[PDB]
């Protein structure tokens with residue numbers, strides 16, 4: 001079980017080192033989010049810091065700038081091609097997670113998104129197109145991460161309708177959160193198992209290893225410290241295809257941070273292990 005995080009900001013050398021110090025352990029995976037108007041030259045100083053630390057960089061690559069119709073039709077290809085050439089030249093093993101949470105309704109490339117422009121077909125053609133361009137440019141170092149949100153949210157969404165095939169995927173991944181009672185829509189406290197079991201059952205049918213790419217717990221509505229202890233136990237005990245757990249450390253929709261309380265931090269430090 002590799003331990004990773006988005007550390008709440010872009011992973012400069014100091015942000016990586018600070019989070020490592022905070023959690024009392026090596027970060028095996030450092031997570032970054034970038035959009036589709038960011039070139040690799042902007043990524044480079046962060047990647048150099050990650051690799052100099054001896055970590056793997058996972059990039060969630062968010063095309064706010066191009067929907068799946070745009071992408072499948074080649075309208076982003078200059079930008080994709082430059083990224084693939086630059087990543088190949090860089091040479092280091094990078095985990096790339098494009099077009100994530102497509103079984104939700106909140107990103108403009110997602111199948112559930114309310115413009116209705118993204119379908120299983122446009123999504124798969126888009127994802128395959130990206131991978132084809134990277135392979136054409138020799139970027140064998142880039143490992144492809146397929147993703148689902150823990151719940152299917154929005155019309156038309158499913159765990160695998162948008163799956164582009166094992167020939168296009170190195171890892172699958174699940175994101176999900178215990179929102180506790182924090183959201184006025186009526187969120188409730190959920191254990192790790194209540195959050196993740198359904199998505200895991202669907203992905204466990206695919207012969208690829210699984211990453212928990214984004215997860216955290218709120219403080220409100222239950223005991224976050226115990227939730228952390230029990231979540232890592234659950235991962236190790238019953239989610240055996242999961243090979244990495246990548247916390248989402250940011251005080252954002254709620255205080256997802258590992259140090260949202262002293263008790264949560266103590267639990268996290270213990271749970272992640274040696």
Ligand SMILES: *[C@H]1O[C@H](CO)[C@@H](O)[C@H](O[C@@H]2O[C@H](CO)[C@@H](O[C@@H]3O[C@H](CO)[C@@H](O)[C@H](O)[C@H]3O)[C@H](O)[C@H]2O)[C@H]1F
Nearest residue numbers: 009010033034035036062064175177214248250252253
């Ligand atoms: C996983 O679920 C999270 C909980 O709901 C949600 O907050 C995450 O949203 C993503 O959050 C990251 C970090 O806040 C954003 O990162 C920003 O990405 C842009 C590139 O698009 C960067 O330029 C910027 O520096 C990053 O902070 C994501 O945009 C956002 O989708 C969700 F992924």
